[PDB]
Amino acid sequence: RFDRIIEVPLPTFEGRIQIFKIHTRKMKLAEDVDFKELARITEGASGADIKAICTEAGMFAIREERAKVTMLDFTKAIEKVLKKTTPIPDLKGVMFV
Amino acid sequence: AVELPLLKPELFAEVGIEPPKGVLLYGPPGTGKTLLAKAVANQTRATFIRVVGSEFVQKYIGEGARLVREVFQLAKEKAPSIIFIDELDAIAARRTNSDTSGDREVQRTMMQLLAELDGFDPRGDVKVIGATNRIDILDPAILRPGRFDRIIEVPLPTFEGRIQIFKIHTRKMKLAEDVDFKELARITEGASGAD
Amino acid sequence: IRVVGSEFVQKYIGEGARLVREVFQLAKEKAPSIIFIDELDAIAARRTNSDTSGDREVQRTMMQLLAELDGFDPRGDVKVIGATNRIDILDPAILRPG
Amino acid sequence: SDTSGDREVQRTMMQLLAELDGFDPRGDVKVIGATNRIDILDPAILRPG
Amino acid sequence: ALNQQTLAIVNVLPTSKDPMVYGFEVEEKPEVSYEDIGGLDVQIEEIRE
Amino acid sequence: LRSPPLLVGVVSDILEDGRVVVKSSTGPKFVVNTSQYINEEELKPGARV
Numbered sequence A: 001r002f003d004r005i006i007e008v009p010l011p012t013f014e015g016r017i018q019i020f021k022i023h024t025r026k027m028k029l030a031e032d033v034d035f036k037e038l039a040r041i042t043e044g045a046s047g048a049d050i051k052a053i054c055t056e057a058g059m060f061a062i063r064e065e066r067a068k069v070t071m072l073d074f075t076k077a078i079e080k081v082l083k084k085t086t087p088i089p090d091l092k093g094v095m096f097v
Numbered sequence B: 001a002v003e004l005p006l007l008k009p010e011l012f013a014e015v016g017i018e019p020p021k022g023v024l025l026y027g028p029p030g031t032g033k034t035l036l037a038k039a040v041a042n043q044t045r046a047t048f049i050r051v052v053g054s055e056f057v058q059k060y061i062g063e064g065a066r067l068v069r070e071v072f073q074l075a076k077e078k079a080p081s082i083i084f085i086d087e088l089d090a091i092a093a094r095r096t097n098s099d100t101s102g103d104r105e106v107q108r109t110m111m112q113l114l115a116e117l118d119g120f121d122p123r124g125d126v127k128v129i130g131a132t133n134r135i136d137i138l139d140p141a142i143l144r145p146g147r148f149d150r151i152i153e154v155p156l157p158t159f160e161g162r163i164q165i166f167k168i169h170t171r172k173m174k175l176a177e178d179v180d181f182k183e184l185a186r187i188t189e190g191a192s193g194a195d
Numbered sequence C: 001i002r003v004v005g006s007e008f009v010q011k012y013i014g015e016g017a018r019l020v021r022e023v024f025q026l027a028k029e030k031a032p033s034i035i036f037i038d039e040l041d042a043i044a045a046r047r048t049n050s051d052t053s054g055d056r057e058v059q060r061t062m063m064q065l066l067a068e069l070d071g072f073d074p075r076g077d078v079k080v081i082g083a084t085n086r087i088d089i090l091d092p093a094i095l096r097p098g
Numbered sequence D: 001s002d003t004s005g006d007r008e009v010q011r012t013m014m015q016l017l018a019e020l021d022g023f024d025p026r027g028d029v030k031v032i033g034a035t036n037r038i039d040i041l042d043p044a045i046l047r048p049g
Numbered sequence E: 001a002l003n004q005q006t007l008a009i010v011n012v013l014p015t016s017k018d019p020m021v022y023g024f025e026v027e028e029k030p031e032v033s034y035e036d037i038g039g040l041d042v043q044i045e046e047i048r049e
Numbered sequence F: 001l002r003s004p005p006l007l008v009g010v011v012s013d014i015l016e017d018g019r020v021v022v023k024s025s026t027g028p029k030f031v032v033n034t035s036q037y038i039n040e041e042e043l044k045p046g047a048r049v
């Protein structure tokens, strides 16, 4: 009835970066932004997530009164998005050798 | 999140800020979720469409979804517009469970909304202000960013916060020469702006 | 305006929400009016499952009367006045002072 | 029933029976049915005859 | 179409039931275009094939 | 285009003084005159006319 049954999972390391590339392109020039490094913080995120990180990275941009989106803005925005959904506890690791 | 798109788009252009597509509010009751929305309507002056997430769903099958679709298309037509939705509590269900009618007809009007904000064609100029009390019984599709980009918790005010809420009411009224707000706010800790 | 507030909530979907809406609207039109909502036991519901269909159906009717009550739409010099017998069933929304 | 289309479902079954071989001749028909799932049917239909 | 004045056919019309956006509306160019193929790239290839 | 209008009805009763009650596809019933431009044995309640 379909035949081509697709699981559309959460984007990979490489996948997430492709999405950031379109966004960064709209948010003008950069000089210290590394798309991989973004991936490592944002490890396990979705496509709509990345768009909202980008929206807030922009906001964070005008509080320093900038006309472009540098790396600090992304760091902050990633941190904000992620914040409500850390901490993830791993303090069973004091009960494991 | 809504003011800058309407008066200040030249600023979104210059930096390159992507458009937002809602801000979601939740919090304990009476904190002033309603006030935040009331201030925004009054103070951004653009099409304030006020609806209620329980006004939706009517006695004919599939009616509810039709009604929703009308609000969203009308906002698109009357853009710039802000839709203020109160109460997502009985129009969105995190569970899907079948062989029922009270939790399967409401899920097909839930599905329409997911789906009218980012519809086929994004965007409109909505900027949907969601308001609910708990997101624990809202679907994950509402809660995740890309619409409802900013997840604003609204908690119980702070100590200095509470001193300000007192002076908000006292300004309309009058008082004696013995009111120290600091001592009052201490007692009224743990309490919403309504209390 | 005297309403038995337990004879709202019909088994047909969203019809319940209709009925309470109309009575509320009349209340702003014909102001000052005192509305008596009897039994908030049965038009109130819990957010923790105890019947899948029951809690949510009732909730739509409930959140509707609440919306008119001070949700955004005018009070209309209402003035509720209402009774219930149980305070442990009450959805946090209506319960709070304000 | 909840009660817009629902009433109608029991309403149509009265017709189909009726004609099938309730009282009327049927000829070389040979009403052939099909259904998606196994048990979703009324007992009448399941019942040989 | 029937001319109401005497109630005969004066014109044959095209299809169908009544089309609104009951199968119509073509947009596929901005904002989502084929420059948004930076997915999720493998999933797009499955669709493409 | 100017029509030869004939309105479709079905026959409701037949009178034994030579008139026929036909109910219209519009809704009303009217009394009409019995054929002399066609068969009168092809008139019966339930005759499409």
Ligand SMILES: Nc1ncnc2c1ncn2[C@@H]1O[C@H](COP(=O)(O)OP(=O)(O)OP(=O)(O)O)[C@@H](O)[C@H]1O
Pocket (backbone or CB within 6 Å): B028, B029, B030, B031, B032, B033, B034, B035, B132, B133, B165, B168, B192, B193, B194, B195, C070, C071, C092, C093, C094, C098
């Ligand atoms: N932050 C505040 N500062 C000043 N007064 C407030 C504040 N919040 C609430 N109030 C007062 O309490 C009233 C009632 O609460 P309000 O309608 O603002 O609640 P809400 O958070 O939308 O609730 P619910 O969860 O029940 O839908 C206000 O109209 C105002 O008088």
Ligand SMILES: [Mg+2]
Pocket (backbone or CB within 6 Å): B030, B033, B034, C071
């Ligand atoms: Mg509220």
